[PDB]
Amino acid sequence: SPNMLVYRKMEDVIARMQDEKNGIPIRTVKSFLSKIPSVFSGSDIVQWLIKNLTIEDPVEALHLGTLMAAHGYFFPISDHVLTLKDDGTFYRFQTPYFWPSNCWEPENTDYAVYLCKRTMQNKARLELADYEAESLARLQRAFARKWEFIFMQAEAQAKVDKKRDKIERKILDSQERAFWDVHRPVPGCVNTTEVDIKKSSDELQQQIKYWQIQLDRHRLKMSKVADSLLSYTEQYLEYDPFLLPPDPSNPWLSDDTTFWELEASKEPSQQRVKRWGFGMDEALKDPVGREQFLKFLESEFSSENLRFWLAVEDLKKRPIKEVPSRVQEIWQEFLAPGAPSAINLDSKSYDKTTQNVKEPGRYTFEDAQEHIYKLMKSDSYPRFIRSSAYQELLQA
Amino acid sequence: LAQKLAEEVPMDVASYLYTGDSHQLKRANCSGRYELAGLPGKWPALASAHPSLHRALDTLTHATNFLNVMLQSNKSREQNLQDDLDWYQALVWSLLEGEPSISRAAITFSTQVFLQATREESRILLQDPHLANATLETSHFKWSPPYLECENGSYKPGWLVTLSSAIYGLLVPEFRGVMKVDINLQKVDIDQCSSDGWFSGTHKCHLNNSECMPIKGLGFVLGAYECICKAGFYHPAYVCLPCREGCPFCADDSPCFVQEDKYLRLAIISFQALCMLLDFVSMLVVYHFRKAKSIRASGLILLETILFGSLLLYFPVVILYFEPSTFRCILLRWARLLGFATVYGTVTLKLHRVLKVFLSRTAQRIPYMTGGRVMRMLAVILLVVFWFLIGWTSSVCQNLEKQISLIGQGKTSDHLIFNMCLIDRWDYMTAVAEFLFLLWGVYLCYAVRTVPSAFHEPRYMAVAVHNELIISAIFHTIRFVLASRLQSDWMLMLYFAHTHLTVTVTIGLLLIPKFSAWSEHSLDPEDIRDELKKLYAQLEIYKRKKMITNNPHLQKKRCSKKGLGRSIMRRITEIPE
Amino acid sequence: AQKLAEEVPMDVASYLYTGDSHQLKRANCSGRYELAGLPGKWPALASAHPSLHRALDTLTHATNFLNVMLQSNKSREQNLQDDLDWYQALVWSLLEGEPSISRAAITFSTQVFLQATREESRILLQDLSSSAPHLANATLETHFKWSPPYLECENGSYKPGWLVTLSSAIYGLLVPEFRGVMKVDINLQKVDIDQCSSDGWFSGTHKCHLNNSECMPIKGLGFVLGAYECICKAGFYHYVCLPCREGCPFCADDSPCFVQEDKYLRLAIISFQALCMLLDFVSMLVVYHFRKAKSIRASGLILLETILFGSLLLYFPVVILYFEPSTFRCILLRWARLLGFATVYGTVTLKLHRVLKVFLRVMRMLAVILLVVFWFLIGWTSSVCQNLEKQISLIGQGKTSDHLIFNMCLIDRWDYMTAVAEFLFLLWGVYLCYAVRTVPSAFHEPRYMAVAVHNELIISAIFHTIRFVLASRLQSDWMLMLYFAHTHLTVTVTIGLLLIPKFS
Amino acid sequence: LKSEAESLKGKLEEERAKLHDVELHQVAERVEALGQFVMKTRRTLKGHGNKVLCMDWCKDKRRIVSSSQDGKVIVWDSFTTNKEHAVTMPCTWVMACAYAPSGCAIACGGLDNKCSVYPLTFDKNENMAAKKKSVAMHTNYLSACSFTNSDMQILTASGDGTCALWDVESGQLLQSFHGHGADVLCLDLAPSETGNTFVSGGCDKKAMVWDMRSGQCVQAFETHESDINSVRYYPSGDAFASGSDDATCRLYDLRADREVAIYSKESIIFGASSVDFSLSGRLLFAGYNDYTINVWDVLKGSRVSILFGHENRVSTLRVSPDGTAFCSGSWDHTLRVWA
Known part of the structure; x- marks a missing residue:
C-alpha cells in the first residue's frame, strides 16, 4: 500500500526528531499564571528542520513542517486546527498508539462518546466550539436509542483517569483530544486522511533467446547519449521560451498576441527557416516546410516520392471503413506496375507489397515507406538545404 | 406725618430755612x-x-x-x-x-x-x-x-x-x-425720623420694611436723617422691591435664575409618554399573541415582567419636570432600582437556565429548570433591594427629614442660582453594585457562546448587557463629578439619554426579532493501560446497569449487552496477546 | 502696692475697710x-x-x-x-x-x-474765717x-x-x-465707690481674679469698702471660688458626675471572655490534629475552622465595651458582629442545603454573602464618617440617667433592620430543618443544627430587643452583662453542639 | 545453462561499463549552469465545484480541457477565463480527459469502464454530452487516453492490465496488449511520427513499451519502489523519465537501455503525481504530494525553484505544446496557469 511508505518515511523523520542526544528539548514553561511543563515553541522546530534538513527556504521548511503537523505528529496546545506557526506557542508530539499510521478509523458512536465526556468533565462552560456543538446536536437527534452506556463509560473513564495524578489527566486528555482533531477536522482545513479510489484496491530456449536478444540489443555509450541530449537541447536551447526566449514577447506574461499570430502567418520567420535546416522530419512536421519543399520538388520535376509518403501518412489517418478503398487504389496508382506514379521497389519490398495488398492493413506499406523514406532523407533534404531558395528565404 | 402736615404752613422759604440753610430764606424776607x-x-x-x-x-x-x-x-x-x-x-x-x-x-x-x-x-x-x-x-x-x-x-x-x-x-x-x-x-442737629425728639417720627419711610438712620451733619434742618428700605431694591423713592423670588439681597429687582424652555420640555414629556405607552401596548399584544413558536421558547411571564418593570424605569424623566422636593428624589431611587433588577436580573437568570437545560438535556431530558424556577430566584433579589430602600429611606424619614438636612437644594454656576436633588455616598455604592451584578451576567454570556440554539437569543441579550454596563458607567461618572455645573436642562439631557438608550435597546433587541512522560514505551503502555482500564470499568458499570438501565427493552438490552460483552472480551484477549 | 498701702491709718481701717463705727463712734482721731x-x-x-x-x-x-x-x-x-x-x-x-x-x-x-x-x-x-x-x-x-x-x-x-x-x-x-x-x-x-471698676476710685478686684472669677460688685451704697461681691463661675464655692470636679457644671459640691464602677467584677468578666476565645483557638488546633475518622468527611475540617474563626472574629464586642466609647469603637462593633454572624451561619445552612440535595459548590454560595456584608460596612461607614463625623450628629454620647453621667456607643435605625436580617437568614434554615424531618445519618446532625437555629432566632432576637428598647436609660454595667450573657449562651452553645460528639 | 545466462548478464555488465565509462552528469557538469527564474501565477480558474483530476491542452495553444470527479467536464479559455462549453458526465471519478488535435472531440472516462467521446464543436447548442457515442469500453475503471494523432483512434488503459486502440464511430477494437498483470496507469504517444509506439507501466513496479505495429512487448524496465503514476517521453523521441509515490523520479534511455540518473531529494518525501518536459527539453516538471511543484535541471540535478501555490495536493500537470507555460492539476478545487 503506497501511503504506508510515506508515513514510514515521516516516522523516520520524527524518530530522528525526538532523538536522545540530539533533538528538540521538551521544556517546562513557568508563567505568572501557571507552570506548564513538556512543551516547546514552533521556532524551535523550525530551527530543528533548518539545521538537520538544510531546507534553504524558511518558507519551504515551514511548508514541510505544516503538512507534517497536519498529519498528527505535533499540534498547537490551544487550537483545534493543526497549523505550525513559527512563533512562541506550545506544541507536543503524539503517542505511538495514536499515530495515523495505525489504520485507525473512528465512528459516529465514538464521536458521541468523546462529546459526552468533554462536555461532562468540567461543567463550568460549554467547553467546545460551535462546529463540535453542532455535531453533538445531530448525534443526539439521530442516536435516540443508544446514549446511556456512552455517558456511563465516559464518566467512568473520567474517574479512571482523574484518579491518576493531575498532570497525567492533563497530558492524556490533551493528546486524546488532538488525535480526534486530526481525524475529524474543522470545516475549513483539508482532511489529511483520504485516499484516491485508484489506490482503493524449450523453456530455457525462450530464456536463452531472451539472453541472445539482449546480446544483439545494440547499445551505445552514455557519453554518446550525453552528446545527443546536450546537442538536442542546444539546437533549441535558444528556442526555450522559459530559459532564454528568442523573442521576449510572451502572450502570457507581456499581454501580447503577436508571437502566436506570427506563428499563424504562413511566411516563415528566420528562426523558422534556421529550424527547418535541422531535419526534414521537422520540415514535414511544419506545414510551411511541406509546402516549400513540395514547391522545390515540383519545379525540379521531382515531386513524387514526397507525394507518396504524404499519401501513406494521409492513409494512416482514416478509419477501417476506407482502408481497403484506398489500399487497392493506391496500389493501382503508385504500386501497380504500369501506373504513372512509379514507386520503385526491390525484391523483398515488392514481394511484401504484393502479399499484403490483398489485405488492407494499418501497417500496410512499412518496408516500402522505409525504403523511400531513407531515400528522401538521404538525398532530397540535403540539396534542399543547399538550395538557393532556402538560402534566399533564410536571409530574410 | 403731622410734622410736615404741621409745617406745611411755612411762611417764607421755610424748608429753605427749615430743611435747607436759611441764607436766601433770610435774604428773601419781608x-x-x-x-x-x-x-x-x-x-x-x-x-x-x-x-x-x-x-x-x-x-x-x-x-x-x-x-x-x-x-x-x-x-x-x-x-x-x-x-x-x-x-x-x-x-x-x-x-x-x-x-x-x-x-x-x-x-x-x-x-x-x-x-x-x-x-x-x-x-x-x-x-x-x-x-x-x-x-x-x-x-x-x-x-x-x-x-x-x-x-x-x-x-x-x-x-x-x-x-x-x-x-x-x-x-x-x-x-x-x-x-x-x-x-x-x-446750631442744633435734628431728626425727622427719630424715636423721640423734635418731630421724632418717620416722614415717608414705611418702617414695616424700612429702617431710618438719623445722622449728624450741617445741623438744625429737616432732611437731617437717612432712610433705608429693607430686603428689597429701592424703587429708583427708596422703597423695597423684593427679588423675583426669595433670592435675597436685592440690588436690582432682577432674577438670579436661568429660566428654561417650553418647546424643549413639552416634547420631552410627550415623547417619553409615547414610549411608555408602547410598553403598555406590548403587554396587550402578548396578551393577544399567547400562541407562537418562540414565546414557548421564551416564557410569556418573563416578558411581561421585563416590559412592566422597564415601563416603570421610564419614571426619572417625568419626574424632573415637576419641581424637586423631598418626595421626588426618594421615588426616583425606588423606581430606578426596582426597574433595574426586574429587568437586567431576570434576563441574566434566563441565560443561566439556558446553560442548565443544556446539560440536563444532554444527560436525561427531565426538565431540569423550568419557568416555574425563575420567579423564585427573582423574589430573593426583590427582597434584598426592599430592605435596602428601607435603610436609606429610614435614615431620611426618621433623622434628617426636618431636623438638620434636606435635598431640595441649589448651588450656583458663576453667580446664578439653580436648585435640584443631590447626592451622598449611597448613590456611589449603588452604582458599584450595578456594575458588579452585570459583570456576573457578562461571564455568563461569555461561556455561553457555542450552543446550537434556535433564534440566537444569546447575541441579542449579551449585547444589551454590554451596552448597558458601558452607558451606565459613563452616566454615573459624569453626574457624580458634576454636582456643581448642572442646571435642570443639561441634566435632563443626561437622564433622557440614559433612559431612551437602554430602555429602547433592551426592549428591542429581544422583543422585535421575534416577529421576523512524553515518551514511547512509557506513554505507549500508559495510553494502552488507560484504554484497558476504561474498557474494564465500562464493563463493570455495564454489569451493574443490567437492571439499572431498565429504561428500554430486554432483548434490545440483551443485544446491547451481548455485543458489548463480545467486543470487550475480544479487546481483552487482544490486550493479552 | 494697694495691699501694702492698707497699713496706712490706725483706728481708721474700720472707717477705711469696714467703713464702720469702730473707727467712728469710738475712736480718737x-x-x-x-x-x-x-x-x-x-x-x-x-x-x-x-x-x-x-x-x-x-x-x-x-x-x-x-x-x-x-x-x-x-x-x-x-x-x-x-x-x-x-x-x-x-x-x-x-x-x-x-x-x-x-x-x-x-x-x-x-x-x-x-x-x-x-x-x-x-x-x-x-x-469769720471758716469752711475753707x-x-x-x-x-x-x-x-x-x-x-x-x-x-x-x-x-x-x-x-x-x-x-x-x-x-x-x-x-x-x-x-x-x-x-x-x-x-x-x-x-x-456717702459716696459710692468701685473696687472692681475698669477705672474708678482705686479699683482693685483683689477677691476674684481668674479662678472661676467674676466680680458682681455692690454698686451704690456710699464710701464703703467690701462692696464688690464676686461670683464663682461654674465650679465650687468652698472667699472661695473653685473649679468643678470635671467638665460638669452645677458644682454646688465638688462631687463627681459619673457612675460608680465595679472594676473587680470587670476583670473576671474579661478573663472569662478570653477563656471562651481561648477555647475557640484551641479547638481549631484540636481539629487540625485529629482529622482522620468519621467527623472529617461528614463535617469539613475547612468548615469547622470557618466556624471557629467566626467565633474568634465574634467575641470582641465584650472587650470593646469594657473600654471607653470613642466613635472608632462603635464601628468595630458593627464589623465584628455582622462578619462573625454571616461567616458562621452561612456555612451552617449550606451544609443543610447540601443534605437536602443528597435527599434527591459551597464556597461559590458563601463568598457571595461575605461580599454583600463587605459592601455594607463600606457604605454605612463612609456615610457616617465622611458626612456625619463632623457636620450634624455625634455618636459617642455623654447621656445622663439621674444625677450621674455615662458614655456609650449609640445606635441607628440601620442596626434595627440588621437584626431583622438575623431573624430571616435563620428562619430559612428553620423551614429547612422542619420539613427535613426524618432524614437519616448516624449523627442526628440535623437535629443538632436545627436546635442551634431555633435557639439563636429566639434569643438573639431578644438580645437585640433588650438593647434597643431602653438603651437611653442604661448604666454602663447592666449592658455589659447583657452582651456577655447572650453571646456566651448562644454561641458557646452553637460551638458545643458541633464539637462535643466528635471525640466520643 | 544458468551459468551461461549469468555470463551473458556479466557480458551485459561489461558492455555497460564500456558504454557508461563516464556518467551522464559526470560529463554534464561541463555545460554552463543555469540562472534565476521568476515564474509565478498569471491566471486562475474558478469554475469547478470539487477536486480537479485531469487536464490537457489543445493544439491551438490557448484553450483548456479539464474534467472533475463530480461529473462535470469543462472547456475554458485561460487567455479569457470565459466558458464556451460545458458538459456533464453520467458517472463519478472522471479520471482522464483528452483533446482532439484539430479540436473535434474529447474522451472522458474511468470507473464506468466505458470511454465516451463528444464532438467538441459548436454543433448542437443543446448539450455537449447528448451526442454520447460509446466508443471504447473495458470492464474496469479507465486510466487515460492519447488520441494518437489522427483524431479517429484513441488509446485507453484500465485496471485490466491491458490496453488497445479503439476506433471513433465503430467501437471496433483494433489490437490488444496483454503483457501485464496489474493496474496500468500511464500512456503517452511518442513524439516521432516514425513508429507509432507508446509506453504502459503500472502497479507491477515496472514499465513496458508496446510497439503498436504488432502488439508485442519489445522493451521492459523495473526499478520503482511502488506503483507508478505517470510517464512522458524525452521530447526528442529518444528516452523517457518519470516519478511515482517513491518520490524518487528517474530517467531512462532507449538506446543504452539503462537508468541515466536518479532524481530524488530527502526533503520532498511525498508522492510524485505527474511529469512533463519543457519544449527545450531542458527543465523537468513534476507536481508532487507535498503541495509544491518542483522544477529540476535535467543535467546538473539541482532544484531550481519551489513555487508554492496549491492549498492541497497536485493531481496532474502538463506543458503547453507551443512551449510557453504550464498548468497544474491539484486538490484545491481550481486551476492556475503557471508561467
Whole structure:
C-alpha cells in the first residue's frame, strides 16, 4: 500500500526528531499564571528542520513542517486546527498508539462518546466550539436509542483517569483530544486522511533467446547519449521560451498576441527557416516546410516520392471503413506496375507489397515507406538545404 | 406725618430755612420779627434733649436760687445807684463771659431799670412785653420753642429760646423784674425720623420694611436723617422691591435664575409618554399573541415582567419636570432600582437556565429548570433591594427629614442660582453594585457562546448587557463629578439619554426579532493501560446497569449487552496477546 | 502696692475697710483724713459722679461773678456800707445751693473772712474765717485747687462725714494777684465707690481674679469698702471660688458626675471572655490534629475552622465595651458582629442545603454573602464618617440617667433592620430543618443544627430587643452583662453542639 | 545453462561499463549552469465545484480541457477565463480527459469502464454530452487516453492490465496488449511520427513499451519502489523519465537501455503525481504530494525553484505544446496557469 511508505518515511523523520542526544528539548514553561511543563515553541522546530534538513527556504521548511503537523505528529496546545506557526506557542508530539499510521478509523458512536465526556468533565462552560456543538446536536437527534452506556463509560473513564495524578489527566486528555482533531477536522482545513479510489484496491530456449536478444540489443555509450541530449537541447536551447526566449514577447506574461499570430502567418520567420535546416522530419512536421519543399520538388520535376509518403501518412489517418478503398487504389496508382506514379521497389519490398495488398492493413506499406523514406532523407533534404531558395528565404 | 402736615404752613422759604440753610430764606424776607413757633416743637419747650441745654439749665436754676436767696437777703439797703449796679452788670455780663450759649439777654427790674445786655461781639451791649405781662399774671423760665430772629423780616435765626425768670423783690417776696435770655438752638442737629425728639417720627419711610438712620451733619434742618428700605431694591423713592423670588439681597429687582424652555420640555414629556405607552401596548399584544413558536421558547411571564418593570424605569424623566422636593428624589431611587433588577436580573437568570437545560438535556431530558424556577430566584433579589430602600429611606424619614438636612437644594454656576436633588455616598455604592451584578451576567454570556440554539437569543441579550454596563458607567461618572455645573436642562439631557438608550435597546433587541512522560514505551503502555482500564470499568458499570438501565427493552438490552460483552472480551484477549 | 498701702491709718481701717463705727463712734482721731493718694491716681473728676460737675458749675459761676465784679474799674475796697451784706448773702445762697456742702468760707484781702456751715436748715454764718480759705496754698501756687477727703476732726473724734474740698484763689484786679481764697467742703463719705471698676476710685478686684472669677460688685451704697461681691463661675464655692470636679457644671459640691464602677467584677468578666476565645483557638488546633475518622468527611475540617474563626472574629464586642466609647469603637462593633454572624451561619445552612440535595459548590454560595456584608460596612461607614463625623450628629454620647453621667456607643435605625436580617437568614434554615424531618445519618446532625437555629432566632432576637428598647436609660454595667450573657449562651452553645460528639 | 545466462548478464555488465565509462552528469557538469527564474501565477480558474483530476491542452495553444470527479467536464479559455462549453458526465471519478488535435472531440472516462467521446464543436447548442457515442469500453475503471494523432483512434488503459486502440464511430477494437498483470496507469504517444509506439507501466513496479505495429512487448524496465503514476517521453523521441509515490523520479534511455540518473531529494518525501518536459527539453516538471511543484535541471540535478501555490495536493500537470507555460492539476478545487 503506497501511503504506508510515506508515513514510514515521516516516522523516520520524527524518530530522528525526538532523538536522545540530539533533538528538540521538551521544556517546562513557568508563567505568572501557571507552570506548564513538556512543551516547546514552533521556532524551535523550525530551527530543528533548518539545521538537520538544510531546507534553504524558511518558507519551504515551514511548508514541510505544516503538512507534517497536519498529519498528527505535533499540534498547537490551544487550537483545534493543526497549523505550525513559527512563533512562541506550545506544541507536543503524539503517542505511538495514536499515530495515523495505525489504520485507525473512528465512528459516529465514538464521536458521541468523546462529546459526552468533554462536555461532562468540567461543567463550568460549554467547553467546545460551535462546529463540535453542532455535531453533538445531530448525534443526539439521530442516536435516540443508544446514549446511556456512552455517558456511563465516559464518566467512568473520567474517574479512571482523574484518579491518576493531575498532570497525567492533563497530558492524556490533551493528546486524546488532538488525535480526534486530526481525524475529524474543522470545516475549513483539508482532511489529511483520504485516499484516491485508484489506490482503493524449450523453456530455457525462450530464456536463452531472451539472453541472445539482449546480446544483439545494440547499445551505445552514455557519453554518446550525453552528446545527443546536450546537442538536442542546444539546437533549441535558444528556442526555450522559459530559459532564454528568442523573442521576449510572451502572450502570457507581456499581454501580447503577436508571437502566436506570427506563428499563424504562413511566411516563415528566420528562426523558422534556421529550424527547418535541422531535419526534414521537422520540415514535414511544419506545414510551411511541406509546402516549400513540395514547391522545390515540383519545379525540379521531382515531386513524387514526397507525394507518396504524404499519401501513406494521409492513409494512416482514416478509419477501417476506407482502408481497403484506398489500399487497392493506391496500389493501382503508385504500386501497380504500369501506373504513372512509379514507386520503385526491390525484391523483398515488392514481394511484401504484393502479399499484403490483398489485405488492407494499418501497417500496410512499412518496408516500402522505409525504403523511400531513407531515400528522401538521404538525398532530397540535403540539396534542399543547399538550395538557393532556402538560402534566399533564410536571409530574410 | 403731622410734622410736615404741621409745617406745611411755612411762611417764607421755610424748608429753605427749615430743611435747607436759611441764607436766601433770610435774604428773601419781608415781615416783622421774632416768629416763635413756641410749643409746635415735638413735646414743648419743657423737655430735655441736649448737653448744652442742661448746661444753661444749671446756669438758669442756680442763678434763680441765687436770686431767691439774694433778693431775700438781710440789710437790703437797695443801693441801686451806689454800687449795686456794678454787682448787677458784672453778674449779667460775666454770666455770658462764663456761659457759651451767649446771644442776648436782659435783666429789667425795679427792686425799667434794665441791664439789657447782649454779647454783640465781646462787649455786652447794655441798655435800659407780653412776657412781663405773663410774669405779672402768674417762678419759671418762660422759654419758647424754636423762634427766629427779629431782623424786621421773620428772623435771621433758626431755633432759639426765650428763657426768662423774674428779679422778684421783697410781707412776703414779690415779682419786681424780668431776667431773660434767648440762646439760639439754630446750631442744633435734628431728626425727622427719630424715636423721640423734635418731630421724632418717620416722614415717608414705611418702617414695616424700612429702617431710618438719623445722622449728624450741617445741623438744625429737616432732611437731617437717612432712610433705608429693607430686603428689597429701592424703587429708583427708596422703597423695597423684593427679588423675583426669595433670592435675597436685592440690588436690582432682577432674577438670579436661568429660566428654561417650553418647546424643549413639552416634547420631552410627550415623547417619553409615547414610549411608555408602547410598553403598555406590548403587554396587550402578548396578551393577544399567547400562541407562537418562540414565546414557548421564551416564557410569556418573563416578558411581561421585563416590559412592566422597564415601563416603570421610564419614571426619572417625568419626574424632573415637576419641581424637586423631598418626595421626588426618594421615588426616583425606588423606581430606578426596582426597574433595574426586574429587568437586567431576570434576563441574566434566563441565560443561566439556558446553560442548565443544556446539560440536563444532554444527560436525561427531565426538565431540569423550568419557568416555574425563575420567579423564585427573582423574589430573593426583590427582597434584598426592599430592605435596602428601607435603610436609606429610614435614615431620611426618621433623622434628617426636618431636623438638620434636606435635598431640595441649589448651588450656583458663576453667580446664578439653580436648585435640584443631590447626592451622598449611597448613590456611589449603588452604582458599584450595578456594575458588579452585570459583570456576573457578562461571564455568563461569555461561556455561553457555542450552543446550537434556535433564534440566537444569546447575541441579542449579551449585547444589551454590554451596552448597558458601558452607558451606565459613563452616566454615573459624569453626574457624580458634576454636582456643581448642572442646571435642570443639561441634566435632563443626561437622564433622557440614559433612559431612551437602554430602555429602547433592551426592549428591542429581544422583543422585535421575534416577529421576523512524553515518551514511547512509557506513554505507549500508559495510553494502552488507560484504554484497558476504561474498557474494564465500562464493563463493570455495564454489569451493574443490567437492571439499572431498565429504561428500554430486554432483548434490545440483551443485544446491547451481548455485543458489548463480545467486543470487550475480544479487546481483552487482544490486550493479552 | 494697694495691699501694702492698707497699713496706712490706725483706728481708721474700720472707717477705711469696714467703713464702720469702730473707727467712728469710738475712736480718737484728732485729725482730718486726707485723700492725696488715698484716692485713685488722681480722678480729678475724670472718674466723676455728676455731682462733681454740679459743684464745679456753681463754683465757676460764682468765680466769674466775683472776678468780673472785682475787675470792675476803680476797686474801692468799699467793705463799709453794704458790700459785707453782698458777700454774706452770696455765701448764704452758696452753701444753700448744695444740700451736701457742709461748710464753706470766702476770704478776700487784696485773715478775716466770711464763713457758713449748715446747722439744720439755715446757713450758720458769721464774718469769720471758716469752711475753707487757703491763702497759704494760694501763695504757694504764687486754675482752682482740688482737695482731699477728710474727717470731721482736727483735735477731736472724727464725727460723721468725710470732707472733700473744692478751693480757689481769688485773682485780684491792670494786673492780677492773690486777693482772696474761697472754698467749700462736702461729705465725701456717702459716696459710692468701685473696687472692681475698669477705672474708678482705686479699683482693685483683689477677691476674684481668674479662678472661676467674676466680680458682681455692690454698686451704690456710699464710701464703703467690701462692696464688690464676686461670683464663682461654674465650679465650687468652698472667699472661695473653685473649679468643678470635671467638665460638669452645677458644682454646688465638688462631687463627681459619673457612675460608680465595679472594676473587680470587670476583670473576671474579661478573663472569662478570653477563656471562651481561648477555647475557640484551641479547638481549631484540636481539629487540625485529629482529622482522620468519621467527623472529617461528614463535617469539613475547612468548615469547622470557618466556624471557629467566626467565633474568634465574634467575641470582641465584650472587650470593646469594657473600654471607653470613642466613635472608632462603635464601628468595630458593627464589623465584628455582622462578619462573625454571616461567616458562621452561612456555612451552617449550606451544609443543610447540601443534605437536602443528597435527599434527591459551597464556597461559590458563601463568598457571595461575605461580599454583600463587605459592601455594607463600606457604605454605612463612609456615610457616617465622611458626612456625619463632623457636620450634624455625634455618636459617642455623654447621656445622663439621674444625677450621674455615662458614655456609650449609640445606635441607628440601620442596626434595627440588621437584626431583622438575623431573624430571616435563620428562619430559612428553620423551614429547612422542619420539613427535613426524618432524614437519616448516624449523627442526628440535623437535629443538632436545627436546635442551634431555633435557639439563636429566639434569643438573639431578644438580645437585640433588650438593647434597643431602653438603651437611653442604661448604666454602663447592666449592658455589659447583657452582651456577655447572650453571646456566651448562644454561641458557646452553637460551638458545643458541633464539637462535643466528635471525640466520643 | 544458468551459468551461461549469468555470463551473458556479466557480458551485459561489461558492455555497460564500456558504454557508461563516464556518467551522464559526470560529463554534464561541463555545460554552463543555469540562472534565476521568476515564474509565478498569471491566471486562475474558478469554475469547478470539487477536486480537479485531469487536464490537457489543445493544439491551438490557448484553450483548456479539464474534467472533475463530480461529473462535470469543462472547456475554458485561460487567455479569457470565459466558458464556451460545458458538459456533464453520467458517472463519478472522471479520471482522464483528452483533446482532439484539430479540436473535434474529447474522451472522458474511468470507473464506468466505458470511454465516451463528444464532438467538441459548436454543433448542437443543446448539450455537449447528448451526442454520447460509446466508443471504447473495458470492464474496469479507465486510466487515460492519447488520441494518437489522427483524431479517429484513441488509446485507453484500465485496471485490466491491458490496453488497445479503439476506433471513433465503430467501437471496433483494433489490437490488444496483454503483457501485464496489474493496474496500468500511464500512456503517452511518442513524439516521432516514425513508429507509432507508446509506453504502459503500472502497479507491477515496472514499465513496458508496446510497439503498436504488432502488439508485442519489445522493451521492459523495473526499478520503482511502488506503483507508478505517470510517464512522458524525452521530447526528442529518444528516452523517457518519470516519478511515482517513491518520490524518487528517474530517467531512462532507449538506446543504452539503462537508468541515466536518479532524481530524488530527502526533503520532498511525498508522492510524485505527474511529469512533463519543457519544449527545450531542458527543465523537468513534476507536481508532487507535498503541495509544491518542483522544477529540476535535467543535467546538473539541482532544484531550481519551489513555487508554492496549491492549498492541497497536485493531481496532474502538463506543458503547453507551443512551449510557453504550464498548468497544474491539484486538490484545491481550481486551476492556475503557471508561467
